[PDB]
Amino acid sequence: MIVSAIAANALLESVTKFHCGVIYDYSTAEYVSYRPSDFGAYLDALEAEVARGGLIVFHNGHKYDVPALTKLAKLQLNREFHLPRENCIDTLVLSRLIHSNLKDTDMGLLRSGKLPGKRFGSHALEAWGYRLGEMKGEYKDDFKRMLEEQGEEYVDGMEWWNFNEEMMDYNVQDVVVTKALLEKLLSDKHYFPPEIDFTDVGYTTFWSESLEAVDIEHRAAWLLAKQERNGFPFDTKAIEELYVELAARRSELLRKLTETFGSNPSSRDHIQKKLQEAGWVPTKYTDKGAPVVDDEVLEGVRVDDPEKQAAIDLIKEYLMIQKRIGQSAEGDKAWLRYVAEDGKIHGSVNPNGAVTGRATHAFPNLAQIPGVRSPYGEQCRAAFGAEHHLDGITGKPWVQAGIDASGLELRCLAHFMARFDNGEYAHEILNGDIHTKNQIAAELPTRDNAKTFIYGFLYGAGDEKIGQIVGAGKERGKELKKKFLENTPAIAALRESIQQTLVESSQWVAGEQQVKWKRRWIKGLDGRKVHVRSPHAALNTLLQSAGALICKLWIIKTEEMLVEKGLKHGWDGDFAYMAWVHDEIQVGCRTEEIAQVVIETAQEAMRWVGDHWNFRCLLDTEGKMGPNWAICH
Amino acid sequence: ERIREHLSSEESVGLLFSGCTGINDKTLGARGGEVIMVTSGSGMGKSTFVRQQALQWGTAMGKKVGLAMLEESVEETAEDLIGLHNRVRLRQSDSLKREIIENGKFDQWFDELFGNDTFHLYDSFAEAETDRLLAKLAYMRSGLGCDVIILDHISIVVSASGESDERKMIDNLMTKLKGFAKSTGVVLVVICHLKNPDKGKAHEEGRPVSITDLRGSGALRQLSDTIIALERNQQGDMPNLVLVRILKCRFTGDTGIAGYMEYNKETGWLEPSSYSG
Amino acid sequence: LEESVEETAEDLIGLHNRVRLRQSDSLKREIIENGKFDQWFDELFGNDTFHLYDSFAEAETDRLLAKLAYMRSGLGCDVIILDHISIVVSASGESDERKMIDNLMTKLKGFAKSTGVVLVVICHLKNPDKGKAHEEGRP
Amino acid sequence: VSITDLRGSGALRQLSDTIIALERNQQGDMPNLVLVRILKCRFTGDTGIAGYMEYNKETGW
DSSP states (O other), X not given: OEEEEEEESSOTTSOOOEEEEEEEETTTTEEEEEOGGGHHHHHHHHHHHHHHTOOEEESSIIIIIHXXXXXXXXXXXXXXXXXXXXXXEEHHHHHHHHTSOXXXXXXXXXXXXXXXXXXXXXXXXXXXXXXXXXXSOOHHHHHHHHHHTTOOOOOTTOTTSSOOHHHHHHHHHHHHHHHHHHHHHHTOTTTSOSSSOTTTSOHXXXXXXXXXXXXXXXXXXXXXXXXXHHOEEBOHHHHHHHHHHHHHHHHHHHHHHHHSSOOOTTOHHHHHHHHTTTTOOOXXXXXXXXXXXXXXXXXXXXXXXXXXXXXXXXXXXXXXXHHHHHHHTSSSOTTTTTBOTTSEEOOEEETTOSTTSOOEEESSOTTOOOOTTSTTHHXXXXXXXXXXXXXXXXXXOOEEEEEEETTHHHXXXXXXXXXXXXXXXXXXXXXXXXXXXXXXXXXXXXXXHHHHHHHHHHTTOOHHHHHGGGTOOHHHHHHHHHHHHHHOHHHHHHHXXXXXXXXXXXOEETTXXXXXXXXXXXEOSSSOEEOOOOSSOOHHHHHHHHHHHHHHHHHHHHHHHHHHTTOOBSTTSSEEEEEEETTEEEEEESSHHHHHHHHHHHHHHHHHHHHHTTOSSOOOEEEEEESBTTTOO | OHHHHHHHSOOSOOOOOOSSTTHHHHHOOOOTTXXXXXXXXXXXXXXXXXHHHHHHHHHTTOOOEEEXXXXXXXXXXXXXXXXXXXXXXXXXXXXXXXXXXXXXXXXXXXXXXXXXSOOEEOOOOSOOOGGGTHHHHHHIIIIIXXXXXXXEOSOOOOOSTTSSOTHHHHHHHHHHHHHHHHHHTOEEEEEOOOOOOOSSSOSTTOOOOOSSTTTSSOSHHHHOSEEEEEEOOTTSSOSSEEEEEEEEETTTOOOEEEEEEEEOTTTOOEEEXXXXX | OOSOHHHHHHHHHHHHTTSXXXXXXXXXXXXXXXXXXXXXXXXXXXXXXXXXXXXXXXXXXXGTHHHHHHIIIIIOOSEEEEOOSOOOOSOTTSSOTHHHHHXXXXXXXXXXXXXXXXXXEOOOOOOOOSSSOGGGOOO | XXXXXXSXXXXXXXXXXXXXXXXXXXXXXXXXXXXXXXXXETXXXXXXXXXXXXXXXXXOO
């Protein structure tokens, strides 16, 4: 196993030249520096570690280093350089896995003054250097101040323009931090046993003799990096074709909403000063004094003035128009600013910045696009589809396949409660109408009330919120929950074993529950440490971890089987991963025939995961074929 | 004809090992026909562990558990079960025994547990001859209709006395016990005891129990499908800490260390622990 | 002699379709909720080529050799498979089963050849306790 | 010694609820080391090695 980190001229989007790179080999216990005229030998040294059957350690390698050296080897040396996933390790990925929390631990490091506040909780290489005591300085700062003591000014992102011996020295500096952070991650005896040097071993022994979560996260991070490079095709004209229908409506409404109110329907310090003059008495306030002015209360605001009352719905539309504009046409997001020259949006994704499960998406958040049930969402969802590019060569309309996890949340509960009811509740899922059973069990009037109950009750809603479902308060809530526990004993006993797994005894002392903690981490499905939580609720943490870890393995096995079936991944191939959303995925497909294979494969892949972890409940998927996202869901 | 009938209605008696997950991850539990072998160092939790499952199975997932405690009267086993159900060391307290009786709290717990009419036991103690248990063990399974039969301590053979070495009695008994299990389709959990090694520190102070150190030429390593083993150093910093080790699993074949557990001196339960040596 | 005929077929069924039907509760559940048993089953055992032993309840020596002969002769089988041959259950009272297996092996060898069937039998291994044993290498 | 090695013709190994046994290597380098072994306890059924102890030869116990 060798440890490295590289230095290029810019990001992966427009990287042109390779500057330097250092390779520390543990068998020789000595570093090796590479220069612009040594890029060829650098690629050979990495291939040699692959030929021996070892491993290559990069920081942010799955997302940057490895794909950039594939791109850089194509334009500079014109060679096919491709690192296999199995022979690659990303310290950044393990850091987010092993140190998913840090929130706690970083507090003392912050109190110590050993961590910059700008580098709080960051998994960046420099952020970890201060944590381990290996930061002698940063290349960006020893460059800025040294440009002063030389003359020339500074450009926001110019320290990577040209190769200099100080970068070569700080390139080594990034490797020794990568090395020390790697060893800091290998010293956690819950993911890596106390065997031997896990550097000394080959990749075949590495993945299997390590905790399973280690392997999944590197397969997930490798897979998601491909999806970002694939990107999600974007119809610029269509979204532009939305802005006037919103902006003209915004301008026309603003005119009408200034004739009703003389001398901005967008701020809370505005309407509070205005609406409290038309006779509206705020019922619910906020923890800072100001009254609540959300969608809920506005629907119920009643004023004697007919014009003011009718103007409320015009404010309701205004805020929503601003919302769509504020998501589709604003500044520094808006999708329209993120459209790359290939007509696609490359939305980034953090493998699992959320302790339990489900990645985080940003620049732009591809997971918060308005659904087809929300206003103007039909047009918005239509703007996302594989139909925006009809094949990279053949001109063949690419069709989209959208596959989601059928009621994954409730099925995860049946598996963990199958420990107390012997597959009873799991069979009620298969029999169908689990919301009908929960309705009978909790004695609710309508099935829809049971649907919003089972999720609310499971996820820690108070007795008022439960009572407010049927139009009541905490009175009906307590009896609605107590009745459900009696009719479904397994759920109640489930919340016992959990409450007695992380607590020894609890006690209230002047405002704080003083739990005598037995463990501050629930074991997941792969064996990982899953957050710490704090109070009585925890079941929500267990279920969302199960489903997302199911989906993570699901989307990996799906792509693995599709590749195993011969289907090439990419826009120049048969399919391309475009988006992963919670329990659903959107996959571009070159032909309808291929799209059918994707749907069937996703269902078949769902069985390996369900079989692997011996899930007591049946995992299933449903696929929808069509041009865009408004059709596939 | 039988396979369609079996596979459609099959396990269906695959149960659910509680107290610690990981045992389920490597064994998926027991089948209707299999025989679970539970063992550990003398008095380290053999009786305690199996007693939790019988309770657990016979309460939450309404299964009919049959009990055959040959070293303790039926009254003592009920005492533990009653205390175990209500998370209390009902034995380990002269006050608690006196308590629940005078305020009428005994009948409360009693109806709560045995009310579903699930737990059934055998009274004998008088040596209990081999075909004076197997006949009755079948009577539960068949007459009372039990899904799981529990036989604590399998060194009390006592049958056809006059043949050198009871090394055959344990084998002959195990074969008849194993046979009975599948021909009726019952989950059979049996507890045995280990030989005293005297070749180093012995069991109660550490020492992993392999497959050879039990009886070596054992038949119980052959007839029994799954073998659960408990290890704990009661002379260490963690006497309550117990290691669970799968010694055999005909079903999965996945052996090794399952997980850990902690003996709650308050509830007498084996709550799952957090450990990785 | 150590698993139910439904389980042995279960292995055969899964093995035939290149799958781990046993280890998967989902795949068991899959093929049930659509009658897929009949599909794979008729594909496999439909040729009436497989015959097995069902009892568990103590197979005595000439209460096994009798039954093993029934296939060969009555059912017309060409291959007989005997799993685990440390299960004797016969003439208990003769110290050390080292003699029982010898008496058994000769009769098993006899029946096989005098009829011309193919007899495949599985035995186990003495635990050496003399080095690294079987599970960790050792020829 | 095995539970069978206990004295008598066989009433003390049967008619005895709790049987406490002490082991000490009164020749060699251990002697004063005493091991406590529970051979039987019908009242509990939990047998085995309890712990170790010995009050130094200076003052008995």
